[PDB]
Design a protein around this motif. Structure first.
Motif, mmCIF file in Angstrom:
data_model
loop_
_atom_site.group_PDB
_atom_site.id
_atom_site.type_symbol
_atom_site.label_atom_id
_atom_site.label_comp_id
_atom_site.label_asym_id
_atom_site.label_seq_id
_atom_site.Cartn_x
_atom_site.Cartn_y
_atom_site.Cartn_z
ATOM 1 N N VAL A 289 0.854 -1.185 0.000
ATOM 2 C CA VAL A 289 0.000 0.000 0.000
ATOM 3 C C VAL A 289 0.894 1.240 0.000
ATOM 4 C CG1 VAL A 289 -1.662 1.379 1.338
ATOM 5 C CG2 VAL A 289 -1.972 -1.093 1.095
ATOM 6 N N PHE A 290 1.923 1.238 0.847
ATOM 7 C CA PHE A 290 2.834 2.369 0.890
ATOM 8 C C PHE A 290 3.514 2.577 -0.464
ATOM 9 C CE2 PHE A 290 6.886 4.480 1.182
ATOM 10 C CZ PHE A 290 6.536 5.652 1.841
ATOM 11 N N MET A 291 4.120 1.522 -1.001
ATOM 12 C CA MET A 291 4.819 1.616 -2.281
ATOM 13 C C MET A 291 3.946 2.144 -3.428
ATOM 14 S SD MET A 291 6.498 -1.438 -4.604
ATOM 15 C CE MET A 291 4.964 -2.294 -4.852
ATOM 16 N N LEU A 292 2.716 1.654 -3.521
ATOM 17 C CA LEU A 292 1.819 2.041 -4.599
ATOM 18 C C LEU A 292 1.223 3.441 -4.453
ATOM 19 C CD1 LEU A 292 0.264 -1.510 -4.914
ATOM 20 C CD2 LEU A 292 1.761 -0.389 -6.651
ATOM 21 N N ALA A 293 1.102 3.908 -3.212
ATOM 22 C CA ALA A 293 0.583 5.251 -2.933
ATOM 23 C C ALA A 293 1.690 6.308 -3.059
ATOM 24 C CB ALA A 293 -0.024 5.307 -1.527
ATOM 25 N N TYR A 294 2.924 5.917 -2.725
ATOM 26 C CA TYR A 294 4.088 6.809 -2.761
ATOM 27 C C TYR A 294 4.581 7.072 -4.193
ATOM 28 C CZ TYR A 294 7.974 9.282 -0.618
ATOM 29 O OH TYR A 294 8.846 10.267 -0.231
ATOM 30 N N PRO A 295 4.786 8.357 -4.557
ATOM 31 C CA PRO A 295 5.237 8.756 -5.897
ATOM 32 C C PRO A 295 6.728 8.612 -6.250
ATOM 33 C CG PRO A 295 5.033 10.707 -4.573
ATOM 34 C CD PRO A 295 4.552 9.544 -3.702
ATOM 35 N N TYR A 296 7.297 7.437 -6.023
ATOM 36 C CA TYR A 296 8.698 7.211 -6.365
ATOM 37 C C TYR A 296 8.805 5.923 -7.174
ATOM 38 C CZ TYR A 296 13.659 6.044 -6.219
ATOM 39 O OH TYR A 296 14.937 5.723 -6.600
ATOM 40 N N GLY A 297 9.516 5.996 -8.301
ATOM 41 C CA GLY A 297 9.745 4.828 -9.140
ATOM 42 C C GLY A 297 8.594 4.226 -9.912
ATOM 43 N N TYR A 298 8.931 3.199 -10.688
ATOM 44 C CA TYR A 298 7.981 2.465 -11.504
ATOM 45 C C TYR A 298 7.890 1.126 -10.768
ATOM 46 C CZ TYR A 298 6.048 0.124 -15.727
ATOM 47 O OH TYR A 298 5.278 -0.561 -16.647
ATOM 48 N N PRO A 299 6.793 0.906 -10.032
ATOM 49 C CA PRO A 299 6.690 -0.355 -9.302
ATOM 50 C C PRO A 299 6.174 -1.600 -10.013
ATOM 51 C CG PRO A 299 4.862 1.027 -8.719
ATOM 52 C CD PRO A 299 5.707 1.838 -9.662
ATOM 53 N N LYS A 300 6.684 -2.752 -9.570
ATOM 54 C CA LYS A 300 6.193 -4.034 -10.063
ATOM 55 C C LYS A 300 5.760 -4.861 -8.874
ATOM 56 C CE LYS A 300 10.590 -6.540 -10.648
ATOM 57 N NZ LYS A 300 11.155 -7.787 -11.246
ATOM 58 N N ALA A 353 -2.141 9.657 -10.791
ATOM 59 C CA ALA A 353 -1.028 9.880 -11.713
ATOM 60 C C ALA A 353 -0.955 11.275 -12.306
ATOM 61 C CB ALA A 353 -1.045 8.831 -12.828
ATOM 62 N N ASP A 354 -1.903 12.127 -11.944
ATOM 63 C CA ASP A 354 -1.886 13.495 -12.433
ATOM 64 C C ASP A 354 -1.327 14.432 -11.366
ATOM 65 O OD1 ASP A 354 -5.475 14.242 -12.114
ATOM 66 O OD2 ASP A 354 -4.062 13.325 -10.713
ATOM 67 N N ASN A 355 -0.905 13.866 -10.236
ATOM 68 C CA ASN A 355 -0.308 14.655 -9.162
ATOM 69 C C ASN A 355 0.721 13.788 -8.442
ATOM 70 O OD1 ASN A 355 0.340 16.385 -6.948
ATOM 71 N ND2 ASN A 355 -1.747 17.202 -6.874
ATOM 72 N N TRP A 356 1.993 13.964 -8.815
ATOM 73 C CA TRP A 356 3.101 13.200 -8.244
ATOM 74 C C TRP A 356 3.771 13.810 -7.006
ATOM 75 C CZ3 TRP A 356 3.648 8.180 -9.789
ATOM 76 C CH2 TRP A 356 3.008 7.812 -10.990
ATOM 77 N N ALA A 357 3.044 14.659 -6.291
ATOM 78 C CA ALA A 357 3.581 15.267 -5.083
ATOM 79 C C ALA A 357 2.983 14.592 -3.857
ATOM 80 C CB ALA A 357 3.276 16.768 -5.059
ATOM 81 N N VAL A 358 3.728 14.582 -2.761
ATOM 82 C CA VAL A 358 3.225 14.028 -1.508
ATOM 83 C C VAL A 358 2.793 15.293 -0.771
ATOM 84 C CG1 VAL A 358 3.866 13.028 0.719
ATOM 85 C CG2 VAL A 358 4.662 11.986 -1.395
ATOM 86 N N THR A 359 1.505 15.406 -0.494
ATOM 87 C CA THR A 359 0.988 16.594 0.174
ATOM 88 C C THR A 359 0.444 16.274 1.557
ATOM 89 O OG1 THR A 359 -1.186 16.263 -0.860
ATOM 90 C CG2 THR A 359 0.364 17.692 -2.026
ATOM 91 N N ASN A 360 0.488 17.259 2.449
ATOM 92 C CA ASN A 360 -0.046 17.109 3.801
ATOM 93 C C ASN A 360 0.377 15.853 4.554
ATOM 94 O OD1 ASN A 360 -1.673 19.469 4.476
ATOM 95 N ND2 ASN A 360 -2.939 18.907 2.722
ATOM 96 N N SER A 375 -5.431 16.846 -4.578
ATOM 97 C CA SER A 375 -6.856 16.569 -4.583
ATOM 98 C C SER A 375 -7.233 15.289 -5.333
ATOM 99 C CB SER A 375 -7.605 17.770 -5.176
ATOM 100 O OG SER A 375 -7.142 18.064 -6.478
ATOM 101 N N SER A 376 -6.239 14.523 -5.773
ATOM 102 C CA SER A 376 -6.521 13.289 -6.491
ATOM 103 C C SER A 376 -6.738 12.112 -5.554
ATOM 104 C CB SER A 376 -5.413 12.975 -7.487
ATOM 105 O OG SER A 376 -5.337 13.984 -8.468
ATOM 106 N N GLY A 377 -6.134 12.152 -4.371
ATOM 107 C CA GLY A 377 -6.318 11.057 -3.438
ATOM 108 C C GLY A 377 -5.657 11.278 -2.098
ATOM 109 N N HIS A 378 -5.975 10.412 -1.143
ATOM 110 C CA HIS A 378 -5.410 10.466 0.206
ATOM 111 C C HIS A 378 -5.378 9.037 0.769
ATOM 112 C CE1 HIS A 378 -4.157 13.561 3.137
ATOM 113 N NE2 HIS A 378 -4.386 12.624 4.041
ATOM 114 N N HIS A 442 -9.607 7.996 -3.685
ATOM 115 C CA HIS A 442 -9.228 8.829 -4.814
ATOM 116 C C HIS A 442 -10.465 9.440 -5.474
ATOM 117 C CE1 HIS A 442 -10.241 5.924 -8.006
ATOM 118 N NE2 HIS A 442 -9.640 4.994 -7.288
ATOM 119 N N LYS A 443 -10.245 10.513 -6.228
ATOM 120 C CA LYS A 443 -11.316 11.267 -6.886
ATOM 121 C C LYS A 443 -12.216 10.498 -7.844
ATOM 122 C CE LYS A 443 -8.265 12.941 -10.457
ATOM 123 N NZ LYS A 443 -7.842 14.211 -11.080
#
Ligand SMILES: C=C1O[C@H](O[C@H]2[C@H](O)[C@@H](O)[C@H](O)O[C@@H]2CO)[C@H](O)[C@@H](O)[C@@H]1N[C@H]1C=C(C=O)C(=O)[C@H](O)[C@H]1O
Ligand SMILES: [Ca+2]
Ligand SMILES: [Cl-]
Length: 448
Positions: A289-300, A353-360, A375-378, A442-443
């Motif tokens: 869950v962490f890996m897939l939610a976090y905006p780093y790398g191309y995961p498999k 995928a339209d917002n690759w920043a980690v917010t809040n 605003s795409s997800g939390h 997510h939205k």
């Protein structure tokens, strides 16, 4: 949009084709990394796939027609195929291949003894202080190809180009650390177009050959991710992950292929007991869950089989799609790519995928964390043993949302199959997550 691929380890071509149509395509997985499809040595162990005999498409996974059928069926379903490509060596010793060819004394249907480097053994100490031996000597006796040779380069490139002609879209360059980066650059100059290429290079620091040397020829496996994620989730604080990625010394996000575990390290090869795998159950769900939610790398995502403690054993003696019966989740195929938290994590990544920043970012200084993707997800993870009831701030529109880790939105968008999360008028969420649990919204999974 596509953001995650999956390794269907030891899955035959018929099982992969059906999986593309029935699940991977509908769930939005981008591609499938298949086991080596070329002719290899006979034997039941999983590692026989890594001892090539020739480049003919007749392997344990099936024959050439079945392979082509799989590429077509997956492609029609919207899923690409990445082929595990052996660019460093050929089989050790002598024997017979899966397509009937014989070999021995560094003599193969397509290579002569002169097409290999002179025999020498790669010792463990060579990794830290002798790049010449790491790249010119033999990896556990595997015949080391002379990758600087124009003939060898032409032969590997012809194989890669033949695969592309069939429709294959990407390639995993196996044992890339054992091939000089300059040899891979020469090889790529012979490869048609620009397919997706990721190179397997295990670099935890202190190596004579570094992962950074391969950044110009394609993506590179970031093994520090698997190890550090496992170590933090088991022995550290999740709060430390607020700057995970380049901040921890990893390679550029856009160059990395990441994973919680792969076929080697789940067996103790190149990774210690801190690596998290399917055996860890809920711990594995949370790490994914962490890996897939976090905006780093191309995961498999990893898709395994229960090996019952035998690290040499091959896969189950029964297909995944067995006479209308799915051989998943028990003692045969594990099918982690179908686990609700994992498929939900993939859905979240696809929709943020339209917002690759980690917010809040929020944490309790230890094992409770929460962050958004604008605003795409939390999402939120609770790894403490007391309920996470903190109120957190999000940038999401107020309303009712399906916790996609536990269910999904109905076609008419009037209901969820799992619990509902509420985003208040001020954008906050009053969390209610039990110990060792999580939530992701997510939205595109908002109730109407
Ligand atoms: C199984 C792997 O062996 C080597 O990895 C070593 C790392 O390079 C080294 O840094 C680490 O300390 O120790 C590892 C060995 O335990 C190879 O470098 C690596 O390529 C290899 N993994 C792939 C190669 C194969 C041979 O074709 C396969 O058997 C593996 O399954 C591949 O994933
Ligand atoms: Ca080599
Ligand atoms: Cl890998």
């Amino acid at each position: 949009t596509p953001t995650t691929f999956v390794h269907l380890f030891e899955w035959n071509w018929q099982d992969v084709a059906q999986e593309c149509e029935q699940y991977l395509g509908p769930k939005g997985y981008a591609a499938v990394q298949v086991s080596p499809p070329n002719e290899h040595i006979t034997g039941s162990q999983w590692w026989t796939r890594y001892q090539p005999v020739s480049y003919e498409l007749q392997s344990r996974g099936g024959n050439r027609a079945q392979f082509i059928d799989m590429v077509n069926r997956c492609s029609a379903a919207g899923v690409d195929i990445y082929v595990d490509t052996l660019i460093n060596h050929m089989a050790a010793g002598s024997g017979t291949g899966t397509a009937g060819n014989s070999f021995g004394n560094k003599s193969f249907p397509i290579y002569s003894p002169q097409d290999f480097h002179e025999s020498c053994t790669i010792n463990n100490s060579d990794y830290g202080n002798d790049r010449y031996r790491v790249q010119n000597c033999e990896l556990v006796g595997l015949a080391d190809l002379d990758t600087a040779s124009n003939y060898v380069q032409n032969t590997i490139a012809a194989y890669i180009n033949d695969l592309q002609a069939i429709g294959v879209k990407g390639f995993r360059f196996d044992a890339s650390k054992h091939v000089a980066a300059s040899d891979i650059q020469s090889l790529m100059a012979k490869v048609n177009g620009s397919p997706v290429v990721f190179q397997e290079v295990i670099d935890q620091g202190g190596e004579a050959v570094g992962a950074s040397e391969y950044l110009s020829t394609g993506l590179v496996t970031e093994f520090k991710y698997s190890t550090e994620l496992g170590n933090t989730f088991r022995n550290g604080s999740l709060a430390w992950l607020s700057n995970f990625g380049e901040g921890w010394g990893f390679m550029p996000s856009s160059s990395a292929v990441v994973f919680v575990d792969n076929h080697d390290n789940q067996r103790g090869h190149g990774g210690a007991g801190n690596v998290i795998t399917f055996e860890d159950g809920r711990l594995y769900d949370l790490a994914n869950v962490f890996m897939l939610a976090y905006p780093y790398g191309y995961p498999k995502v990893m898709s395994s089989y229960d090996f019952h403690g035998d690290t040499d054993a091959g896969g189950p003696n029964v297909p995944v799609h067995n006479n209308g019966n799915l051989e998943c989740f028990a003692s045969n195929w594990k099918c982690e790519h179908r686990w609700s938290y994992i498929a939900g994590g993939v859905d979240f990544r696809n929709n943020t995928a339209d917002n690759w920043a980690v917010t809040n970012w929020w944490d309790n200084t230890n094992n409770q964390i929460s962050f958004g993707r604008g605003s795409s997800g939390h999402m939120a993870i609770n790894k403490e043993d007391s309920t996470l009831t903190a109120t957190v701030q999000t940038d999401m529109a107020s309303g009712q949302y399906c916790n996609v880790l536990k269910g999904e939105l109905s076609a008419d968008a009037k209901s969820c199959s799992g619990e509902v999360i509420t985003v208040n008028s001020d954008g906050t969420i009053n969390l209610n997550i039990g110990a060792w649990d999580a939530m992701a919204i997510h939205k595109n999974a908002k109730l109407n």
